[PDB]
């Protein structure tokens, strides 16, 4: 089912805004949804295609919101690091992007 938190991230009010793809003489899902915070950084992704590949690690939502506030206030962003839910390990940066 839907997590009670889902409709808090993808606000219903924005639904009318998105451009809905027209497929098979019938309307289908939008090109993209626009959550109140980037989700691609919350969950990340993995994918293999043709010519291009992709891996993006998860990040702590709180950090993301902090930086969103920073931008909202014309403030310098903090640098973020991979974060996993309920994970009890340690992560150390070795080189930018590593």
């Amino acid at each position: 089912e839907l997590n009670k938190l889902t409709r808090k991230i993808f606000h219903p009010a924005d639904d009318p805004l998105y451009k809905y793809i027209q497929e098979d003489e019938k309307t289908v899902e939008p090109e993209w949804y626009l959550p109140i915070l980037p989700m691609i950084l919350v969950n990340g992704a993995e994918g293999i295609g043709t010519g291009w590949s992709t891996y993006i690690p998860p990040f702590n939502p709180l950090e993301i919101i902090k930086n969103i506030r920073h931008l909202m206030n014309d403030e310098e962003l903090e640098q973020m690091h991979p974060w996993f839910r309920g994970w009890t390990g340690t992560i150390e940066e070795i080189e930018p992007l590593r």
């Binding site: 980037p38 950084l41 993301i64």
Partner: peptide, 12 residues
């Protein structure tokens, strides 16, 4: 994208 914050911004 070359940095996480680049992504974050382009979203923002």
């Amino acid at each position: 994208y070359n940095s996480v914050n680049e992504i974050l911004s382009e979203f923002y």
